[PDB]
Enzyme design. Structure first.
Site, PDB file in Angstrom:
ATOM      1  N   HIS B  41      45.893  34.081  33.462  1.00 54.41           N
ATOM      2  CA  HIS B  41      44.919  33.112  33.591  1.00 54.41           C
ATOM      3  C   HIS B  41      43.774  33.596  32.857  1.00 54.41           C
ATOM      4  CE1 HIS B  41      44.449  35.332  37.382  1.00 54.41           C
ATOM      5  NE2 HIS B  41      43.145  35.285  36.985  1.00 54.41           N
ATOM      6  N   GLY B 143      36.572  39.065  39.338  1.00 55.27           N
ATOM      7  CA  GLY B 143      36.827  39.969  38.498  1.00 55.27           C
ATOM      8  C   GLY B 143      37.735  41.184  38.783  1.00 55.27           C
ATOM      9  N   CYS B 145      40.956  40.749  39.191  1.00 58.15           N
ATOM     10  CA  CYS B 145      42.063  40.433  38.886  1.00 58.15           C
ATOM     11  C   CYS B 145      42.523  41.140  37.702  1.00 58.15           C
ATOM     12  CB  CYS B 145      42.162  38.859  38.227  1.00 58.15           C
ATOM     13  SG  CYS B 145      41.620  37.750  39.485  1.00 58.15           S
TER      14      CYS B 145
HETATM   15 ZN    ZN Z   1      41.510  35.720  38.559  1.00 54.45          ZN
END
Ligand code: ZN
Ligand code: ZN
Lengths: 306, 306
Positions: B41, B143, B145
């Site tokens: 993503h 952030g 991720c």
């Molecule tokens: Zn994310």
């Protein structure tokens, strides 16, 4: 969101741990530039520790009596000296992995990360606080001596603790990197008393602010209180008294949540007198005091290091 | 002695985190050999996340649309592909700091360390468990991720988790390094239900053995019980049922303490029915289930890594 007992990344410190051997004793050392730091009782046997004369013991040792092993490589000891309770072994090779570092003597209630090591190899990392009685409640087995505690500020490593001994009560004691013990302890195997352990009130308050930020607000009552009336209750439960310096440090947290420091104190007072009643705060059924106000902002904003 | 929620040293992993930027989104990636892994993503905008068609979105992107930054140096993207929910970006430089690593899909109840990162820089490290409902209770801000979870076996790093999303309930979800989600979740911003979260009974038992090893033995009653009668009580309190495999794994701990597994179960049953009564075990007023039997032996023996 979420809140965890978080330690600093230990990479910069892993490259500084060595194995120090003198005679039969082996423990961990810290290799910065061309000098290795380690507990001075590496020169003692099990029998020496009951009543050691460190000066007389150190006279019998020469530079070649010390074996310094960096992972799988040997540093040559060309100079040794005793500074308070640490040995400074001057070696022939400067550590290529030396980070920007400072030596700092922390104050009670401050937190830091411990890298537990055995035979010069890292085993794990955890976060803890210096208790008001200058002990730490760590996790240490035989051979962990010389393990260090540290903080990180951007790219600089602040070394604040070297582990030296476990007291008969199961708690742990050590020095700064200049070899000065925290607390009234000595590197001798004898019964030593630690004072009363109190709860670090400013850290509890910071934790309660973390709870509000993360959605736990049941403990927020609609009362208030004064600093004097609060400290009177705190002292009855062995809580450190609160000063204006503490109120100042909490300011940023008060502004972000809209909850005045004194209002939070009134909430804490109620928790002390009435308990949690089977409830939890941030997943805990006890009040936590191992997060400083700075730790809370760091974790609730996303501070990073190199 | 002592017992702490301990994480693995993160040095080997710090040298593998990079910053991945596609368009406006920036998150963390894992750089091993000449390939970078990151959540897919990263190609989505805030509006795309409500209902993303990842295949159609990925067609619009070319190799030069991805900015991979290792600390302060740029890797050239010469190949990209989508494996389940992760992107594999093939770059021109192999990571010189690549450690021995494996990819592993852990099972619920297992523990691992998380290195929380922002903009490709490590922020902190903590230890957690995969819940029985395949969520983790972590600490993640925007952030984070691409942050990874890992275990260490001697000198080899086992990557088991990549962070992808926070559910509306505050818990966290992610994939293995092949991009397969743990649990029934999808990388879309929609209401998703996590199942009932149960307590990892085998880990509680291991923790109780750790308490005995460290001197807390008040909870030891003189009763016993059967596996069937125990599981009947466990299920009433949302505790995972115990199997013979679990009894086998606890064997070394039973032998070291002289306390039979079934005897420990009888002690736990009493704690479930009667509570702790204002007492603590290893400093906790709740039963802890984030230590596996292997974690307990590791911390109570002094296992090390390179
Ligand atoms: Zn994310
Ligand atoms: Zn020692």
């Amino acid at each position: 969101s979420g809140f965890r007992k978080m330690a600093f990344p230990s990479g910069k410190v892993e490259g500084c741990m060595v194995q120090v051997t003198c005679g039969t004793t082996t423990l961990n050392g810290l290799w910065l530039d061309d000098v290795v730091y380690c507990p001075r009782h590496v020169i003692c046997t099990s029998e020496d520790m009951l009543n050691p004369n460190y000066e007389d013991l150190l006279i019998r040792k020469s530079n070649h009596n010390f074996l310094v092993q960096a992972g799988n490589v040997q540093l040559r000891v060309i100079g040794h000296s005793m500074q308070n309770c640490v040995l400074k072994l001057k070696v022939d090779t400067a550590n290529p992995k030396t980070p920007k570092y400072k030596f700092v003597r922390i104050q009670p209630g401050q937190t830091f990360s411990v890298l537990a090591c055995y035979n010069g190899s890292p085993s794990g990392v955890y976060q803890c606080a210096m208790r008001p009685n200058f002990t730490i409640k760590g996790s240490f087995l035989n051979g962990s001596c010389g393990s260090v505690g540290f903080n990180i500020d951007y790219d600089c490593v602040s070394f604040c603790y070297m582990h030296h001994m476990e007291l008969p009560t199961g708690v742990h004691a050590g020095t700064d990197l200049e070899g000065n013990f925290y607390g009234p302890f000595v590197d001798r195997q004898t019964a030593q008393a630690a004072g009363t352990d109190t709860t670090i009130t400013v850290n509890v308050l910071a934790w309660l602010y973390a709870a509000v930020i993360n959605g736990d607000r049941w403990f927020l009552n609609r009362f208030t209180t004064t600093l004097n009336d609060f400290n009177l209750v705190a002292m009855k439960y062995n809580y450190e008294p609160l000063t204006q310096d503490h109120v100042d440090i909490l300011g940023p947290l008060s502004a972000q949540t809209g909850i005045a420091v004194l209002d939070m104190c009134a909430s804490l007072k109620e928790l002390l007198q009435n308990g949690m009643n089977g409830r939890t705060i941030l997943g805990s059924a006890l009040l936590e005091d191992e997060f400083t106000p700075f730790d809370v902002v760091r974790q609730c904003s996303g501070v990073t290091f190199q």
